Amino acid sequence: MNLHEYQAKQLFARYGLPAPVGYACTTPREAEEAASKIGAGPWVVKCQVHAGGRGKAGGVKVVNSKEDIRAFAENWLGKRLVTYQTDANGQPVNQILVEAATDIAKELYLGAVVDRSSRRVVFMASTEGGVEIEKVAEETPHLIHKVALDPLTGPMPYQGRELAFKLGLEGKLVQQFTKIFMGLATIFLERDLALIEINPLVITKQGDLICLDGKLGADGNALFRQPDLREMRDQSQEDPREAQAAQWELNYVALDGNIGCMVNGAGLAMGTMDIVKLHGGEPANFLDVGGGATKERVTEAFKIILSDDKVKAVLVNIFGGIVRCDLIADGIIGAVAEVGVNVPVVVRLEGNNAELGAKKLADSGLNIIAAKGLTDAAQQVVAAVEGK
Amino acid sequence: MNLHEYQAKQLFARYGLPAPVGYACTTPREAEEAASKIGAGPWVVKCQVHAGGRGKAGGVKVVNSKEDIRAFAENWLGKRLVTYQTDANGQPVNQILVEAATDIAKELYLGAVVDRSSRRVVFMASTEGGVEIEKVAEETPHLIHKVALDPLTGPMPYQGRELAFKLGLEGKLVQQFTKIFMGLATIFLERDLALIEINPLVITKQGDLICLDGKLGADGNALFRQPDLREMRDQSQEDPREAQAAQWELNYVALDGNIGCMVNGAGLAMGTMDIVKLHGGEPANFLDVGGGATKERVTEAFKIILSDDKVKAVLVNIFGGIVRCDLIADGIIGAVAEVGVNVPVVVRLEGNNAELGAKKLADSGLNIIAAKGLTDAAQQVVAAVEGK
Amino acid sequence: SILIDKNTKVICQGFTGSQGTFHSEQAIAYGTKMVGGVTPGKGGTTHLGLPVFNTVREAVAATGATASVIYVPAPFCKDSILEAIDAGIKLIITITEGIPTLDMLTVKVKLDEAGVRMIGPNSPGVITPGECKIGIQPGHIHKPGKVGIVSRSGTLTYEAVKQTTDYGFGQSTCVGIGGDPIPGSNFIDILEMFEKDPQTEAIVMIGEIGGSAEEEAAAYIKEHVTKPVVGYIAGVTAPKGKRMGHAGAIIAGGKGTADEKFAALEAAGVKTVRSLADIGEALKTVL
Amino acid sequence: SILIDKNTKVICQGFTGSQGTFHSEQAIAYGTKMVGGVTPGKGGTTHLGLPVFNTVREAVAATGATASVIYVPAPFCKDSILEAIDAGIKLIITITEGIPTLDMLTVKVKLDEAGVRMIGPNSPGVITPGECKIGIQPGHIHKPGKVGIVSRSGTLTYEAVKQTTDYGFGQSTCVGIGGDPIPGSNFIDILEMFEKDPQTEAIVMIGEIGGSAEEEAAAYIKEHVTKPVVGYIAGVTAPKGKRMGHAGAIIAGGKGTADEKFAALEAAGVKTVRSLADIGEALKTVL
Ligand SMILES: CC(C)(COP(=O)(O)OP(=O)(O)OC[C@H]1O[C@@H](n2cnc3c(N)ncnc32)[C@H](O)[C@@H]1OP(=O)(O)O)[C@@H](O)C(=O)NCCC(=O)NCCS
Ligand SMILES: CC(C)(COP(=O)(O)OP(=O)(O)OC[C@H]1O[C@@H](n2cnc3c(N)ncnc32)[C@H](O)[C@@H]1OP(=O)(O)O)[C@@H](O)C(=O)NCCC(=O)NCCS
């Protein structure tokens, strides 16, 4: 799960890492009042949304008057910010971070992720701050420096120094950088982060390192032991259907298309989406039933998939699971009736009572086709959205 | 460095481990007043000295009246407690720990040390609590259970459970034991301990685990990063000469004999002591000069070695070092004069200007013999204490 | 076959729990030599007619089991896995989903240093049709055969199982390496076992988006795998930077797309199939 | 000879510090191929005519050094040692005294897994007389020869050096494994190197109280060392449970006395000598 920039900075402060003086404000009045608590302008006002690219979307401004701060908060609070990293619906802005302006001398990049190839937390740094780090990796790989945290020893100062010297830092900036590495590495491990990105990690004109931005991602699998992080979840930043699906033990991810997909299995779900795509279809979503495709659960699945108006058909692909194919069919039938599923539904059942479940579907009289195999199921859902 | 039992228990409490309700008191008045803060007697009153065997020496009593607590504090405060683990001079009692009586159902042992053979922090537990753990290892090894902390993973609950089940604990005692293991293991690693011993780790009649005693030893090499532990050092518990020696970069350990030994090198010091012993002598001390045998340092060495009235001769064995043999001789000479060394001194110098240093010693006229080799040096110091 | 066979003695950690019970019943019905289970606190009892132990070491001393299947909730897995490694278990099949990536990061290092093989986590398990079933896969769709299957996905594996059983090829051993970002074993590890296994004549490798295990497996196959390999990668239509169900099904930093994996496999000579429904056909081709 | 020789290229960590400077001057005068040093913050300067680097990796890339001698204060050693291991250094000679036992516990595990050899800490160093000197030992008392010396003590080693030089045997290589409880290398590791070294004809093993490395070395010698070994253990008169200078010179739990070590060595066929002054005589005997 993602954290807001202001929350990332609070965490940094809690670990003695440096970030600008700032306040997260929920009302224009709070935002304007923060100006004086911060001091002499100008002030940086930033919409707090999980997505990046806020700057290019107008969500980050340097203003010099309390009236400008207020105008900005008024403009954004309760409005959705669309950036190149959100869908066209954007993310709601419920907090404006008002912080002190920072005199930037140089912009660096410092970040960390779990590198799956080397199976290590890898920190990476670059003199190329203020740029999409991927861009820099593409073009100037030789400018990206990395160190892998050794699980046996924990992060070591020499690794922080190594990056600091590759970045050509010198003097107090080396110790400051080392300190930042050790703290971010420590936070990474103690808080079970999946990702850290300080872009930019700034060298100020006054000669100090400061985290100008912060993007933290927590390992959701570890939230059971990160109570602080757990409370920081901002559900407004994501499609609310995902959390709805999750509390129903469904993994849902909204896509662009019009063919809803309800499948048990993440791999099967993606493969089903791909096969629908392969047969001229446009998957509207990823929905992995995982949990026992019970009647209640399948019903929720339909409710969630159908909350998207673009959905013109629903392909249900169930291979195995804990429920027998005929019980799954009874639930798909109950779901279609009780949800008032007004779209055609194509079902591919495999496992015990597969044909009997198919028969039950065919005999319900509801617009539910029991397909014969996967290719067939794909062609039929594809054909079922023709014209719609 | 060793901690007092009360300090060990404070640390345990700080880590959520269980210890009796108790107070460390420096005056009989405090000790008597602790009774009421603790509650209903009877109360356990324990002299706080680093050495064990306090029980058999009379330093641990279960009393049932405030007047008894006071009488006990009055008897011990400022008095030295001699146990089978101290020298005949004992250790000063400056604190009396007054704690609640504990209803003991069973006594167990839980402890940990750095095992040098397996190069791991090894925790060990036994149903044989209340006994010298060495005794149990000798006789009933099959009753001693061990687990080695994995440096890669840190202590794991299964290890705590493993010991708990080998101890035949069951039910809530298993979780409690596991919790105690995890906490003690954590303290061991975080505080850089060299040793933990809970003897006895008690199962109370009420069915709970409680640390009735606690013996913690800190790795002195790690005190630079254990500020809390550093402050807990009680210098009164050790021969004050050791700390004196240490601040002068000398490692001193008082022994029984009468031939003082001043050597540069721990190995050479022990070997020198052994050779003196081998030639009929009785080493009075271990004193490793280590630090540059300067005049000032050698002087301190003499002051420290000679503070023991039993010393009838001092063997100085210097092999190498940073100071030239003649400068060492000048310092031994200055030391002997300025300290008013009234005993014979035998010196064995090896290295640059060895013979010139010897000549300088022979020409000083002070009672300082420059020996020719080590065997000779030993025989001569041995011979120099004959009759004295 | 690889990893397990008719002689593999298996203990189950989390044996008395719902899934541990249910799936052990299935393994037991299949003929898997389950010899016992471990549930701290229930040692000395019997469950499914087998002894339950308080620790894996007691279980191993008592039964000689060399493999452990784990059905322990995520919060306790690292502990369970390290306990198994410590007790001498040589093969750990971890079914559990939700294990913190950092826990697996440490476990993977331990596994590799202790020389212990782990399949999973977040895995459907391992099955050598006709001989040994450890895991949650439905055993009736399998057929003792010659196709070795490795996959980051349970359900997709079943599809490949159905197909290879329907074309009569059958399966030598099916290995679900799981959908986590840091699995105990990767494609390369399993591919190497299939190459060295006489009974396996062809390999179906099933991957998906995220990480680079498939791309590395490709490079590995080109140079060290001589048997024919049919590949299928799910997620061509998955968005980037979004978890698609499996913790490991996420395209991080724009790297690890399905197309890149197909491409890397194709370039290594792997017979890739764009539709998961054509795995059997492609095997027929290369067989 | 073992460990080092005329061709060993050495860098010094803590190169610009007092001891690093002083002892590098000595190594340099002895002919040791010191090729550089590492002091974070002083990279790009020259000291003792050699390049100083900010990191060990820069130093290794620049000089090709395979050995590093460490003169870094105890608080930073673990970091220095892990940095050297990470930079590819294959031989680390750590002089530093005072390194927390727990730091060495972790370092020792890292050393063993990375296949990096470390002598020390709390060591006088290593010297192959006539070829290479790394450490603080006085080089003029040594003589290119046939006796390999391993010791937990610097000064005692010098005594053995004097004796073996005086009897004309000379030394192949002297290795101070150091006086810490968890050294990077123990007696067994060095003994094995001496047994396999043609130039070493006899071995002087010098131990002291504490731990059980000597007792294990005894068992090892009996079974795997064919060359003659002369042993000396200091501390017969040391009290129990008291640190005698070296952090590792402490008899813990009444185990590890000098007598037990003498006894264990004697029982393995090692020629033990009760007086440290008779090491040369005992070598003469077995030579
Ligand atoms: C592991 C998983 C199956 C557990 O679910 P579950 O059986 O309902 O959990 P339960 O609580 O009923 O049982 C777990 C048992 O583990 C036990 N347990 C806990 N810690 C343990 C340990 N260290 N060692 C052994 N057993 C342990 C518990 O005692 C419990 O048994 P009990 O009920 O007898 O006390 C579930 O958490 C999961 O990960 N599911 C996803 C599986 C998957 O989707 N795989 C991918 C292929 S598509
Ligand atoms: C290591 C030891 C010799 C250091 O003493 P020292 O040289 O006086 O210490 P100094 O502070 O002068 O020098 C240490 C240098 O290490 C450097 N240093 C610190 N951390 C470092 C690191 N990670 N990498 C490299 N160098 C580092 C410092 O920069 C300093 O050099 P500088 O003065 O140029 O800044 C001392 O702490 C010691 O352990 N002595 C006992 C040796 C012994 O008795 N051995 C046993 C055989 S009997």
PDB file of C-alpha atoms in Angstrom, chain B residues 134-288:
ATOM      1  CA  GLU B 134      27.912 -26.548  35.386  1.00  0.00           C
ATOM      2  CA  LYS B 135      27.115 -29.246  37.954  1.00  0.00           C
ATOM      3  CA  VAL B 136      24.083 -30.318  35.886  1.00  0.00           C
ATOM      4  CA  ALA B 137      26.075 -30.328  32.683  1.00  0.00           C
ATOM      5  CA  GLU B 138      28.637 -32.596  34.303  1.00  0.00           C
ATOM      6  CA  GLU B 139      26.195 -35.082  35.735  1.00  0.00           C
ATOM      7  CA  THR B 140      22.952 -34.887  33.730  1.00  0.00           C
ATOM      8  CA  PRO B 141      23.905 -33.491  30.297  1.00  0.00           C
ATOM      9  CA  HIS B 142      20.796 -35.042  28.768  1.00  0.00           C
ATOM     10  CA  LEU B 143      18.807 -32.528  30.852  1.00  0.00           C
ATOM     11  CA  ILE B 144      20.443 -29.493  29.307  1.00  0.00           C
ATOM     12  CA  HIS B 145      18.690 -28.218  26.179  1.00  0.00           C
ATOM     13  CA  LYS B 146      20.216 -25.833  23.756  1.00  0.00           C
ATOM     14  CA  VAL B 147      19.431 -23.741  20.751  1.00  0.00           C
ATOM     15  CA  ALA B 148      21.761 -21.497  18.831  1.00  0.00           C
ATOM     16  CA  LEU B 149      20.580 -18.112  17.725  1.00  0.00           C
ATOM     17  CA  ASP B 150      20.856 -17.890  13.981  1.00  0.00           C
ATOM     18  CA  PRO B 151      22.615 -14.633  13.136  1.00  0.00           C
ATOM     19  CA  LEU B 152      20.795 -14.457   9.850  1.00  0.00           C
ATOM     20  CA  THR B 153      17.317 -14.601  11.270  1.00  0.00           C
ATOM     21  CA  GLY B 154      17.496 -13.499  14.829  1.00  0.00           C
ATOM     22  CA  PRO B 155      15.917 -15.593  17.589  1.00  0.00           C
ATOM     23  CA  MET B 156      12.817 -17.491  16.461  1.00  0.00           C
ATOM     24  CA  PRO B 157       9.724 -18.557  18.415  1.00  0.00           C
ATOM     25  CA  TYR B 158      10.172 -22.169  17.444  1.00  0.00           C
ATOM     26  CA  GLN B 159      13.451 -22.144  19.380  1.00  0.00           C
ATOM     27  CA  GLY B 160      11.707 -20.893  22.448  1.00  0.00           C
ATOM     28  CA  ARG B 161       9.038 -23.569  21.972  1.00  0.00           C
ATOM     29  CA  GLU B 162      11.646 -26.220  21.416  1.00  0.00           C
ATOM     30  CA  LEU B 163      13.218 -25.539  24.816  1.00  0.00           C
ATOM     31  CA  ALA B 164       9.817 -25.146  26.417  1.00  0.00           C
ATOM     32  CA  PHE B 165       8.733 -28.558  25.217  1.00  0.00           C
ATOM     33  CA  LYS B 166      12.008 -30.198  26.134  1.00  0.00           C
ATOM     34  CA  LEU B 167      11.440 -28.779  29.623  1.00  0.00           C
ATOM     35  CA  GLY B 168       8.078 -30.419  29.437  1.00  0.00           C
ATOM     36  CA  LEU B 169       6.215 -27.175  29.809  1.00  0.00           C
ATOM     37  CA  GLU B 170       2.725 -27.087  28.539  1.00  0.00           C
ATOM     38  CA  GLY B 171      -0.168 -24.769  27.976  1.00  0.00           C
ATOM     39  CA  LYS B 172       0.323 -21.123  28.778  1.00  0.00           C
ATOM     40  CA  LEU B 173       3.745 -21.859  30.198  1.00  0.00           C
ATOM     41  CA  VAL B 174       4.939 -22.632  26.688  1.00  0.00           C
ATOM     42  CA  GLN B 175       3.951 -19.217  25.346  1.00  0.00           C
ATOM     43  CA  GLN B 176       5.289 -17.540  28.471  1.00  0.00           C
ATOM     44  CA  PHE B 177       8.538 -19.422  28.129  1.00  0.00           C
ATOM     45  CA  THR B 178       8.704 -18.599  24.441  1.00  0.00           C
ATOM     46  CA  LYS B 179       8.137 -14.958  25.253  1.00  0.00           C
ATOM     47  CA  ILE B 180      10.917 -15.033  27.813  1.00  0.00           C
ATOM     48  CA  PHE B 181      13.300 -16.659  25.361  1.00  0.00           C
ATOM     49  CA  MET B 182      12.476 -14.136  22.608  1.00  0.00           C
ATOM     50  CA  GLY B 183      12.927 -11.227  25.031  1.00  0.00           C
ATOM     51  CA  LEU B 184      16.137 -12.501  26.592  1.00  0.00           C
ATOM     52  CA  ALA B 185      17.490 -13.290  23.141  1.00  0.00           C
ATOM     53  CA  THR B 186      16.534  -9.841  21.984  1.00  0.00           C
ATOM     54  CA  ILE B 187      18.219  -8.256  25.038  1.00  0.00           C
ATOM     55  CA  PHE B 188      21.278 -10.378  24.449  1.00  0.00           C
ATOM     56  CA  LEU B 189      21.669  -9.083  20.931  1.00  0.00           C
ATOM     57  CA  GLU B 190      20.540  -5.505  21.435  1.00  0.00           C
ATOM     58  CA  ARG B 191      22.532  -4.915  24.557  1.00  0.00           C
ATOM     59  CA  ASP B 192      25.582  -6.837  23.483  1.00  0.00           C
ATOM     60  CA  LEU B 193      25.462  -9.168  26.395  1.00  0.00           C
ATOM     61  CA  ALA B 194      28.095 -11.844  26.893  1.00  0.00           C
ATOM     62  CA  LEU B 195      25.936 -13.669  29.367  1.00  0.00           C
ATOM     63  CA  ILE B 196      22.475 -14.249  30.678  1.00  0.00           C
ATOM     64  CA  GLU B 197      21.605 -16.561  33.507  1.00  0.00           C
ATOM     65  CA  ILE B 198      18.158 -16.859  35.083  1.00  0.00           C
ATOM     66  CA  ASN B 199      18.747 -19.342  37.836  1.00  0.00           C
ATOM     67  CA  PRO B 200      16.073 -19.903  38.891  1.00  0.00           C
ATOM     68  CA  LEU B 201      13.531 -19.223  36.225  1.00  0.00           C
ATOM     69  CA  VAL B 202      10.582 -20.189  38.359  1.00  0.00           C
ATOM     70  CA  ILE B 203       7.218 -21.731  37.641  1.00  0.00           C
ATOM     71  CA  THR B 204       5.080 -20.251  40.408  1.00  0.00           C
ATOM     72  CA  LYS B 205       2.422 -22.147  42.318  1.00  0.00           C
ATOM     73  CA  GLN B 206       0.036 -19.831  40.522  1.00  0.00           C
ATOM     74  CA  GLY B 207       1.271 -21.327  37.262  1.00  0.00           C
ATOM     75  CA  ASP B 208       3.445 -18.530  35.855  1.00  0.00           C
ATOM     76  CA  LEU B 209       7.055 -18.142  34.824  1.00  0.00           C
ATOM     77  CA  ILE B 210       9.033 -15.560  36.757  1.00  0.00           C
ATOM     78  CA  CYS B 211      12.730 -14.633  36.846  1.00  0.00           C
ATOM     79  CA  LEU B 212      13.715 -15.115  40.445  1.00  0.00           C
ATOM     80  CA  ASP B 213      17.313 -14.199  39.856  1.00  0.00           C
ATOM     81  CA  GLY B 214      19.140 -12.636  37.002  1.00  0.00           C
ATOM     82  CA  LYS B 215      22.779 -12.540  36.217  1.00  0.00           C
ATOM     83  CA  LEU B 216      23.740 -10.479  33.197  1.00  0.00           C
ATOM     84  CA  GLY B 217      27.194  -9.952  31.816  1.00  0.00           C
ATOM     85  CA  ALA B 218      27.792  -7.267  29.173  1.00  0.00           C
ATOM     86  CA  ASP B 219      30.426  -7.531  26.435  1.00  0.00           C
ATOM     87  CA  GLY B 220      32.819  -4.815  27.663  1.00  0.00           C
ATOM     88  CA  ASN B 221      34.020  -4.361  24.076  1.00  0.00           C
ATOM     89  CA  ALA B 222      30.569  -3.112  23.221  1.00  0.00           C
ATOM     90  CA  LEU B 223      30.095  -0.630  25.942  1.00  0.00           C
ATOM     91  CA  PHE B 224      30.967   2.179  23.555  1.00  0.00           C
ATOM     92  CA  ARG B 225      27.545   1.560  22.014  1.00  0.00           C
ATOM     93  CA  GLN B 226      25.630   0.586  25.193  1.00  0.00           C
ATOM     94  CA  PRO B 227      25.340   3.933  27.012  1.00  0.00           C
ATOM     95  CA  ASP B 228      22.708   2.570  29.459  1.00  0.00           C
ATOM     96  CA  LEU B 229      24.846  -0.417  30.348  1.00  0.00           C
ATOM     97  CA  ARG B 230      27.882   1.788  30.570  1.00  0.00           C
ATOM     98  CA  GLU B 231      26.297   3.789  33.355  1.00  0.00           C
ATOM     99  CA  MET B 232      25.440   0.629  35.290  1.00  0.00           C
ATOM    100  CA  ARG B 233      28.996  -0.343  35.962  1.00  0.00           C
ATOM    101  CA  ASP B 234      29.578  -0.746  39.639  1.00  0.00           C
ATOM    102  CA  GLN B 235      33.298  -0.344  40.212  1.00  0.00           C
ATOM    103  CA  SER B 236      32.979  -1.201  43.885  1.00  0.00           C
ATOM    104  CA  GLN B 237      32.377  -4.830  42.889  1.00  0.00           C
ATOM    105  CA  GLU B 238      35.840  -5.276  41.471  1.00  0.00           C
ATOM    106  CA  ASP B 239      39.407  -4.842  42.739  1.00  0.00           C
ATOM    107  CA  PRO B 240      39.817  -1.032  42.221  1.00  0.00           C
ATOM    108  CA  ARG B 241      43.237  -1.682  40.786  1.00  0.00           C
ATOM    109  CA  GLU B 242      41.741  -3.165  37.663  1.00  0.00           C
ATOM    110  CA  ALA B 243      40.026   0.066  36.755  1.00  0.00           C
ATOM    111  CA  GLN B 244      43.110   1.983  37.740  1.00  0.00           C
ATOM    112  CA  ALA B 245      45.217  -0.214  35.506  1.00  0.00           C
ATOM    113  CA  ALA B 246      42.737   0.074  32.675  1.00  0.00           C
ATOM    114  CA  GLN B 247      42.667   3.864  32.664  1.00  0.00           C
ATOM    115  CA  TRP B 248      46.418   3.571  32.317  1.00  0.00           C
ATOM    116  CA  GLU B 249      46.086   0.998  29.511  1.00  0.00           C
ATOM    117  CA  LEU B 250      47.250  -1.882  31.661  1.00  0.00           C
ATOM    118  CA  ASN B 251      45.383  -5.098  32.212  1.00  0.00           C
ATOM    119  CA  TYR B 252      45.738  -6.110  35.777  1.00  0.00           C
ATOM    120  CA  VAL B 253      44.408  -9.166  37.608  1.00  0.00           C
ATOM    121  CA  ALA B 254      45.418  -9.740  41.216  1.00  0.00           C
ATOM    122  CA  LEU B 255      46.529 -13.270  42.105  1.00  0.00           C
ATOM    123  CA  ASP B 256      47.574 -15.049  45.339  1.00  0.00           C
ATOM    124  CA  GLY B 257      51.383 -15.155  45.055  1.00  0.00           C
ATOM    125  CA  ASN B 258      54.271 -12.828  45.805  1.00  0.00           C
ATOM    126  CA  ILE B 259      56.102 -12.346  42.510  1.00  0.00           C
ATOM    127  CA  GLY B 260      54.675  -9.389  40.681  1.00  0.00           C
ATOM    128  CA  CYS B 261      54.754  -9.733  36.904  1.00  0.00           C
ATOM    129  CA  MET B 262      54.836  -6.826  34.506  1.00  0.00           C
ATOM    130  CA  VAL B 263      54.785  -8.000  30.933  1.00  0.00           C
ATOM    131  CA  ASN B 264      53.730  -6.535  27.615  1.00  0.00           C
ATOM    132  CA  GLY B 265      51.277  -8.957  26.021  1.00  0.00           C
ATOM    133  CA  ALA B 266      48.462 -10.962  27.480  1.00  0.00           C
ATOM    134  CA  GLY B 267      49.936 -14.193  26.180  1.00  0.00           C
ATOM    135  CA  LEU B 268      53.397 -13.310  27.297  1.00  0.00           C
ATOM    136  CA  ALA B 269      51.997 -12.202  30.661  1.00  0.00           C
ATOM    137  CA  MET B 270      50.296 -15.521  31.260  1.00  0.00           C
ATOM    138  CA  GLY B 271      53.285 -17.420  29.965  1.00  0.00           C
ATOM    139  CA  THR B 272      55.568 -15.419  32.190  1.00  0.00           C
ATOM    140  CA  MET B 273      53.355 -16.159  35.148  1.00  0.00           C
ATOM    141  CA  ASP B 274      53.465 -19.802  34.187  1.00  0.00           C
ATOM    142  CA  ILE B 275      57.200 -19.879  33.850  1.00  0.00           C
ATOM    143  CA  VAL B 276      57.578 -18.243  37.273  1.00  0.00           C
ATOM    144  CA  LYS B 277      55.255 -20.924  38.604  1.00  0.00           C
ATOM    145  CA  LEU B 278      57.249 -23.588  36.751  1.00  0.00           C
ATOM    146  CA  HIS B 279      60.443 -22.502  38.492  1.00  0.00           C
ATOM    147  CA  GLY B 280      58.960 -22.689  41.993  1.00  0.00           C
ATOM    148  CA  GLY B 281      57.566 -19.168  42.078  1.00  0.00           C
ATOM    149  CA  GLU B 282      54.121 -17.896  42.969  1.00  0.00           C
ATOM    150  CA  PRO B 283      52.848 -15.157  40.612  1.00  0.00           C
ATOM    151  CA  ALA B 284      51.178 -12.360  42.521  1.00  0.00           C
ATOM    152  CA  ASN B 285      49.473 -10.906  39.516  1.00  0.00           C
ATOM    153  CA  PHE B 286      48.835 -10.715  35.823  1.00  0.00           C
ATOM    154  CA  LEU B 287      49.756  -7.328  34.451  1.00  0.00           C
ATOM    155  CA  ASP B 288      49.874  -6.847  30.763  1.00  0.00           C
TER     156      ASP B 288
END
